[PDB]
Amino acid sequence: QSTQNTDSQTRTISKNTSTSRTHTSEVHGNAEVHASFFDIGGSVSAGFSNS
């Protein structure tokens, strides 16, 4: 029979770097109905966002 004892100390020094590039499109919509005592309106909107 045999017994083994072991100790281990590890020093790990690590580097990392990164880039990233995002390209974002977007198409918005809107409708609106306004009402008053005597004033009524309506509105339609649309939006085109690049990024």
Partner: peptide
């Protein structure tokens, strides 16, 4: 110019909306 003044007060009666970005 009374009609023009009334139109101006009607325009004031409201909001020029907001500028929102959803990017």
């Amino acid at each position: 110019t009374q009609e023009e003044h009334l139109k101006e007060i009607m325009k004031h009666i409201v909001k020029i909306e907001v500028k929102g970005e959803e990017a």
